[PDB]
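Quick one: Rubrivinodin from Rubrivivax gelatinosus IL144, structure tokens please.
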Amino acid sequence: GAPSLINSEDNPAFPQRV
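--- reply ---
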């Protein structure tokens, strides 16, 4: 849910951190 190096939201387009 927040822009990040860590894509722990598993967004398929833009890396987003949970």
